[PDB]
Amino acid sequence: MDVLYSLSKTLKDARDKIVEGTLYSNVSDLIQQFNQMIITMNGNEFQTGGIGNLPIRNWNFDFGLLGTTLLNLDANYVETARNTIDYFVDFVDNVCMDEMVRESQRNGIAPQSDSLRKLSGIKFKRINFDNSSEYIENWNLQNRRQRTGFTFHKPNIFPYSASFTLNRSQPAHDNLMGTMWLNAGSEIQVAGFDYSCAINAPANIQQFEHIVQLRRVLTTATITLLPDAERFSFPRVINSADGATTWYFNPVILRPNNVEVEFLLNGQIINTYQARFGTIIARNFDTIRLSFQLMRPPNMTPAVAALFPNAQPFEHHATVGLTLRIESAVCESVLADASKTMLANVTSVRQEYAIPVGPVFPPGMNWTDLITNYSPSREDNLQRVFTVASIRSMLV
Amino acid sequence: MDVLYSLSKTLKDARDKIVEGTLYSNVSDLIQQFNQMIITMNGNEFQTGGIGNLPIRNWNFDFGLLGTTLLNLDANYVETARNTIDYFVDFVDNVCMDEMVRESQRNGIAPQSDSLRKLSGIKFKRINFDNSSEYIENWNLQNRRQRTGFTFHKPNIFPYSASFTLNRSQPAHDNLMGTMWLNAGSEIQVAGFDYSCAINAPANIQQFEHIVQLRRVLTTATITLLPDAERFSFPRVINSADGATTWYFNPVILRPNNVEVEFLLNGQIINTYQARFGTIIARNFDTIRLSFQLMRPPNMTPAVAALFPNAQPFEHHATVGLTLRIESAVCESVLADASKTMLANVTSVRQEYAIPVGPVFPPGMNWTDLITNYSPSREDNLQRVFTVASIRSMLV
Amino acid sequence: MDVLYSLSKTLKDARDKIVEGTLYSNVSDLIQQFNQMIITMNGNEFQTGGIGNLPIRNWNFDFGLLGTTLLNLDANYVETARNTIDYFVDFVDNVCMDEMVRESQRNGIAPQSDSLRKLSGIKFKRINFDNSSEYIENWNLQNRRQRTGFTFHKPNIFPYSASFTLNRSQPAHDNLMGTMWLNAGSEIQVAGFDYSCAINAPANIQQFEHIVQLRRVLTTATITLLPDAERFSFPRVINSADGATTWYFNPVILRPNNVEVEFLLNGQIINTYQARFGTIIARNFDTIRLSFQLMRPPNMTPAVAALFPNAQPFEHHATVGLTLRIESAVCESVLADASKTMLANVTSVRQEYAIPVGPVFPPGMNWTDLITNYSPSREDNLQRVFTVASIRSMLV
Amino acid sequence: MDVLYSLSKTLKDARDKIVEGTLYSNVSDLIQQFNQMIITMNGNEFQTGGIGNLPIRNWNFDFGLLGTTLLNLDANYVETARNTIDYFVDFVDNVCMDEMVRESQRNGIAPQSDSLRKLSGIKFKRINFDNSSEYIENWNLQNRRQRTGFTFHKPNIFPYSASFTLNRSQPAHDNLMGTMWLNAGSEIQVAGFDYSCAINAPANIQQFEHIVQLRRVLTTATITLLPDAERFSFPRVINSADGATTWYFNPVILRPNNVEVEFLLNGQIINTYQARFGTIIARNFDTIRLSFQLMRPPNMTPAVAALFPNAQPFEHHATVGLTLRIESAVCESVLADASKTMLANVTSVRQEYAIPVGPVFPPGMNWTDLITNYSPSREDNLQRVFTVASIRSMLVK
Amino acid sequence: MDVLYSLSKTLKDARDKIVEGTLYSNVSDLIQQFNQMIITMNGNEFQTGGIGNLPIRNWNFDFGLLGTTLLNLDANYVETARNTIDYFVDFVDNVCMDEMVRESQRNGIAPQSDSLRKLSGIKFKRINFDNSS
Amino acid sequence: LILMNMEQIERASDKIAQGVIIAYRDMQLERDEMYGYVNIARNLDGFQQI
Ligand SMILES: [Cl-]
Ligand SMILES: [Zn+2]
Ligand SMILES: [Zn+2]
Ligand SMILES: [Zn+2]
Ligand SMILES: [Zn+2]
Ligand SMILES: [Zn+2]
């Protein structure tokens, strides 16, 4: 992996630095690294495999070294470099694609394609040099059982789930008490609805609780908390849990009462926020517990008192919302996020070449299914393919 | 462009690395590059800025070389370097501004300002060195006609458009079937509304379709797909198509049925997602075809059954929604997005100096009008000014 | 700060570059810098402080130099380097943590911890080398009295605020004219609501104005302007200004009229956008003025004509909304944003070690209170701790 | 800036010291400085002035050095020196005027005129010598970001504001309770007026409060506090807040009660003065809170008792004043003040040559507009033009 | 007092006149005065403070003399001088603050702070020069 | 290589010392395995350097 990354990094440096007219002193170290790569690869035969529809490709390396006896690079030098660079970039792209489409339950962290296993041989370790990318840095750290860290803008940590729980229900579905939520990506919208507006609740308070368990621990997370949930504040006709019949929802939004956001690690409260909404920090957590109360307002104007009678029928249902958006976080595991392209690149390569479903990943690399059941083997295979995808995205 | 970028990059390196106390070995290659730049620029006269309120600036270069003999840099060395760097940074900023405010219909990719034309001469190609930025790398690749790639977070590919189509309507606007949508920036919110709730539709199904034709092909795109269009889920009084009258829309949201999101390239299905929500990947497409359905609930509770009568008047209008957000994508063409500042830089420079409207760009660099009619000449001019703005933001 | 950053950058480079098999020429400059660091640190005792629960730690430096005479680095070389690197990383992390948890009112930009004050001595200036990160570059430019700016994706410039102004009201809260708004982070959602729908207004137009005074000037700001406010588009039961009673809000959304968004600096209009939605560019401003009008629709279909009677009771309240999202901007000062972890890192370190409240920051480093009262002393302390947090992030 | 200041300083020293009959030992160092200036400037072309009506002036330097063999200065020596000095003073005047009429949004502290930009080059740094003026000293401290200090006699820290607040009012405007204030320059005159004289107040006390927020922090401020406000102590006919009608103010002055001056920094109490009048010291503050009570006097002689009835109509309205004068203060930013001429010089040059409105300063250098919105970019540009104005004043004035 | 004033005036002249690029002849007399101050102050221990909340501060002088150049001062010279100048300015400010907060019914004109009392010793009279304010 | 090892090579010489501290206070002679009692300074901490 570090050798594949080193090939890609050398090729990117050569593309950026070996330009017409440039001082040779600008490229001397890059030229030495490039010539070392050429010497190491020369004489080695590689086969990028024919899994799925990915075509079998054979790679042969007999390339001359780049010259070292110029003061400024000229057009001849750039063209000589660029032919070799093109061949090497093609080879690295095909190796990366071959690795991305492969998985195993046993050693998913280990290389799977024949070319990458060959590149793991000691006779290629000379190619290895500056491992500065976040993905390769974390790869090296995890190879050594060291504390890893990935920074994610809007991490896709929540599997998509648009669900509801009814804590008070009946066949008519007209005096309902419960919660509905969309947990998607980095966003949790939750809303507790009481159709009776807690007329008969003790103290005229209805308590709603929403616990979301993250499949990995998040650290140093900046989160936006907002009082209302705009996704559950308009009238809807919602199917019943069995799907037999459809019930009606006609929310009127009250501000939530005694909002308590707990961020918990192993069930221990690490962070606690009470009645604070703007922008909060959860330093280390794997569970979010949102407690929020519908409080029937003690004093009402006549219209509000009209909305909420003493008994059924209830036509205006008192809903209290909550929005939780993880803007940025740090995770010890790879994750999809709104800014990167590793998941998209891996999925695109697997789709374009009709890679059959394997033992490890769900079909189509579906992220909801993947992150719902983020097993250790899935984590190893995902980190491997994501590191390979980043290596590929350095050149492609 | 490569020379302007090399000047800017050399100056940024000099600002960051020529610091008091630093080992000369940290700067040796940079000092060589800087001295080469000084030698090349010495004895050359430049003029920048004669368009709009951009002032006329004359530039003369007669500077001494930086020393090579120190072991660690001291205050004298840093001061001499800083004076030269200040002059050069001012010159580069003015050249970038002079290029950013000019456009051409014929050869808009080629340099427009006199200074960049002078810098395109062979006698300046020695300045050229490491071209590592994504924008200059794409510029060089586009020069050789290699496949370019710009990564965007929340690409602004959709021109702003809030419109609606009525497939069934009458002058009183009380039995309406149709679609309303907002295509803005990176988001598509589309809602199909039937006022009869598909009482008389065949099989009690109303089909809604929405086609968005992207002006450029997108690859490796990460898409959030959510069932509901919250933007079209509240009571609304809407102007009629000719604006002669207003009509009422009292939505009640049902979940969409048989959701099929197709991503098409050249009218062929590249990606297709059937009832899939959360994160999906569109590997290569220029069109998005969202087809959904309002399916009248076969079973209703008394409240739901009351919402939807057998005939007019229809007071609750059955609406199905869809929200599609492009988080990240790759495009072969420059585009505005949420994280970069190229468009903002170019617009700000053109507004500060009162640049008259030109034959290429719309007035004020209006992005909606620009991406609506994204012609090849507009694309070439925009890539030029965006590359210049990225070069400028390295220093300014 | 420059010295602490240089230490961290040296260690990060050593971790990324001192890898088995690599050519010594790839790392030669780094090895020279590393040996310079060792020479400058050898023989010095440091104490990282006991503030809060952060333990007192003593640091000693008697390390040997790394070798320079191999053609390729080997496993022995990597192990020897790693031993020294681990100690230096621990020391730098502790210095960063000690500096992050301290504040001063008189001179908040100057170092606060004893270790960082010792490292500002001239005897350590030899460690200083490439200052290339955005935060350290801004730090140096600001020490040089040079114009520098931080780039923010979704800057958290707006203190959280959900409030309303009632320009027409009565104790029964049934003929209300006013504005509702949420300013949160980088987002503004405003809505003018008239219960009489401007039945008895001059020209049947109701004017709404909303001014947001930014605590710092923003430049080259990309902004999305959308013509509705989904946060204030559904029925709500809202406390009164004193909380004595609760009133009822029953929006029906009309298109806002004469929408004029002004971006102002020093009370002067810099940018003006009339009836423009989608992407706009605010080049330089400290205030946002949003003017909009609820225009009574001159023609109404019977369904619409019913909703707005000539007199009370008013059941459907005509609301017109605007939404303003700052996607990207540039600020002279430091700010929290959706991408960067500086605030989260500082808050996490302050929470983990039970750092008491100081005379500068609000308790818990709460961002709303901080940005509300962004004083110069707060700004200085906050830039200091944010730069230190970034330096720590390079290694931790 | 340091080079322009050094040029002007050398020229002023030459004008003051190169005088007939003086010992050469009185001027040897000055002669060396003057000759270094001549050597550095020789062979350099400068252009000043292409904005507004400021003419384009071209400057060429080919001068001989002043001699060094004399033991006493004679008339011919002084005349040749004066010729060179006059040319240099004309040049420095023009460079200063060219710099003063320019502004920048980005780097307002940096030079804007081309001549000062050229003078910023390394070759000219040899001219630099004693930087002892307060403005150039503050300039050098600010370049290194050391704590600056500007001493202002009567700082112009308050924008002009003459307004009133009504806490109790009604359309007839005959039972009014409120405050009126003039904040102008270095002065705050405030007055709380109750028309009923706190007859029906809770214990016959009417509390008045006035908050003034300074746009810059002041330190080491000598402040006079006088109990009365002569500005709001005579009959007035005042517009209404909407301007629809006019109300009447017939004040009768009572001594203010429980007078409390508070000087605060970042919303924290720094100085508190209770019942203290005359000279007080506010060591470091950005806000002034004046709180003062109208106390209805329990015992009244018959004329006083006739002034204030039990109920309306109220003809004589009980008013309590306060006058606050900042005599001298220190500010870390430049400011207009009563003794200096920097603002007046900058404005005079800008008006004399019809300098168009720029993107930084108000439409004509109005101090009220500037101080009301004293932004950092404005502060940088103002400090630059004020330092240039002082450099010019060393020679032109 | 004369000595404290002379230290402060020497420091002010050093700040104003020891500037990058200036002729050494502009500063020669000032450099001699400054080096004489360094010689007189070196090896002497001073204590300031210990009244109210004024902190106790200890001052030690172990500085080198300012060098000489052929023609003009350079940036290195200015930074080296500014280190010493900054320490001395800190010391003088602290001595002045220590004296300003003290008073005496008897001999109120005489120095009251320990540092100024030490500075009134004969050894420091060498520092004394132009008393022009 | 020479520049990084210069100090070590110079300090290995038996005929040059790296300096001398004149401290007019009475300092105990150090006990060093190479000398017995020796007025050897390990460093220069606490003294002005000429
Ligand atoms: Cl985002
Ligand atoms: Zn149910
Ligand atoms: Zn984002
Ligand atoms: Zn219609
Ligand atoms: Zn109210
Ligand atoms: Zn009135």
UniProtKB/Swiss-Prot annotation, chain E:
Annotated family: Belongs to the rotavirus VP6 family.
PTM notes: The N-terminus is blocked.
Keywords: Calcium, Capsid protein, Intermediate capsid protein, Metal-binding, Ubl conjugation, Virion, Zinc
Misc. comment: The VP6 trimer contains a zinc ion located at the center of the molecule. The zinc ion is not essential for either trimerization or transcription activity of the DLP. Zinc-depleted VP6 has an increased sensitivity to proteases.
Organism whose genome encodes this protein: Rotavirus A (strain RVA/Monkey/United States/RRV/1975/G3P5B[3])
Function: Intermediate capsid protein that self assembles to form an icosahedral capsid with a T=13 symmetry, which consists of 230 trimers of VP6, with channels at each of its five-fold vertices. This capsid constitutes the middle concentric layer of the viral mature particle. The innermost VP2 capsid and the intermediate VP6 capsid remain intact following cell entry to protect the dsRNA from degradation and to prevent unfavorable antiviral responses in the host cell during all the replication cycle of the virus.
Zinc listed as a keyword: yes
One Gene Ontology cellular component: viral intermediate capsid
Claim: Amino-acid biosynthesis is one of the keywords in the record: no
GO MF annotations in UniProt: host cell surface receptor binding; metal ion binding; structural molecule activity
Positions of the UniProt region annotated as Interaction with the inner capsid protein VP2: 62-73
Any GO BP: fusion of virus membrane with host plasma membrane
Subcellular location as annotated: Virion
Summary of subunit composition and partner proteins: Homotrimer. Interacts with the inner capsid protein VP2. Interacts with the outer capsid glycoprotein VP7. Interacts with the outer capsid protein VP5*.
Name by which UniProt lists this protein: Intermediate capsid protein VP6
Predominant place of localization: virion
